[PDB]
Homo-oligomer: A and B are copies of this chain.
Amino acid sequence: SGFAKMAFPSGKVEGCMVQVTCGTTTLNGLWLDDVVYCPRHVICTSEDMLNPNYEDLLIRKSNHNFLVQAGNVQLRVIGHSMQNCVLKLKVDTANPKTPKYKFVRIQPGQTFSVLACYNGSPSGVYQCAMRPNFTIKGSFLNGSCGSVGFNIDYDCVSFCYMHHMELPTGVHAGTDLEGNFYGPFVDRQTAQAAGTDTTITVNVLAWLYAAVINGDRWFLNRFTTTLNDFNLVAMKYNYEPLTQDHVDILGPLSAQTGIAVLDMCASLKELLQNGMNGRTILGSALLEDEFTPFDVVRQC
């Protein structure tokens, strides 16, 4: 027993991290097969970032303008192209450490692991959620761009995220591995609105099942409710509305604990309108929404 925010083991992804330099900008890339994937803003200076024309900026760049380095060894670039906001650099060497992988666009509320890198070197690993407003609340310093987000499913790495931007609010936006941004964000240094960020109600519920599983039960109460009356309360607290899909997804946890979803929904309702009153739940004094039901099942 016990409960922690646990990332997937990072070794498969470590073996794919490279350094990409173009002009004087250096950031991270991801070497799979004979292609290196990186943020297209690698071609931009500080000044360029204010209002880049990527198409024009790219046109001044040849293969030899891109330095790809893999630990100590330089890779030869034999081709370059831009896919949305990602640059793909064809190199002559297949990565000998390429895992089985795929590229997936995750949905708001799903979670993943981030291997934070600097100059192509793994610095550290943590679990994130794609927020409903398509930001992440990560840890990202200068040179972290091109660090990737992923899930591992047996032997198979599903890459879901590439870090590109810190916004003026100190929050993080990025793309899938085809280079389409999550959310309305662009790869420009201008002020950009994240919407109001809501709580991932389904994830909060999963964590309460986790708490109960762990013996943390005090918040369980004498009520039940309805999907509509719950949602009527959810909406007031900027909680994502709960649907029958969410209910069905929780069912395995329902079954394990003998606690019906709507009963758990009623306990949550009371927490929402009474607070936690000083007590903690799985050692937190807030409601946690960064664990999926899959994430709770795995650890429990």
Write the residues of chain A forming the contact surface with B, with a CB cutoff of 8 angstroms: 1-12, 14-15, 115-116, 122-126, 128, 137-141, 166, 170-172, 214-215, 275-276, 278, 280, 283-286, 298-299
Q: Is the interface of A mostly helix, strand, loop or mixed?
A: loop
Instruction: Identify which of B6, B128, B215 contacts A125 (C-beta below 8 A).
Output: B6
Asked whether A166 lies within 8 Å of B7 as measured between CB atoms, the reply is no
Q: Which residues of B contact A123 (CB under 8 A)?
A: 6, 9, 298
Given contacts A141-B1, A286-B284, contact A8 B170 (CB under 8 A): no
Q: How far is it, in angstroms, between the C-alpha of A6 and the C-alpha of B215 when the chains are bound? A: 27
A138 nearest CB neighbor, chain B only: B2
A276 nearest CB neighbor, chain B only: B285
Chain copies in the assembly?
Answer: 2
Q: Which residues of B contact A171 (CB under 8 A)?
A: 2
Q: How far is the CB of A253 from chain B (nearest CB, A)?
A: 16
Given contacts A284-B284, A284-B285, A285-B284, contact A139 B6 (CB under 8 A): yes
Given contacts A11-B14, A170-B215, contact A1 B137 (CB under 8 A): no
Q: Which residues of B contact A141 (CB under 8 A)?
A: 1, 299
Q: Which residues of B contact A172 (CB under 8 A)?
A: 2
Q: How far is it, in angstroms, between the C-alpha of A196 and the C-alpha of B276 when the chains are bound? A: 24
A278 nearest CB neighbor, chain B only: B275
Asked whether B214 lies within 8 Å of A115 as measured between CB atoms, the reply is no
Q: Which residues of B contact A10 (CB under 8 A)?
A: 9-11, 125
Q: How far is the CB of A53 from chain B (nearest CB, A)?
A: 28
Q: Which residues of B contact A284 (CB under 8 A)?
A: 284-286
Q: How far is the CB of A234 from chain B (nearest CB, A)?
A: 20
Q: How far is it, in angstroms, between the C-alpha of A4 and the C-alpha of B11 when the chains are bound? A: 20
Having A7-B124, A125-B125, one finds 13 other A-B pairs with CB under 8 Å, namely: A2-B138, A2-B170, A6-B139, A7-B125, A9-B11, A9-B14, A11-B12, A170-B215, A275-B278, A280-B286, A284-B285, A284-B286, A285-B285
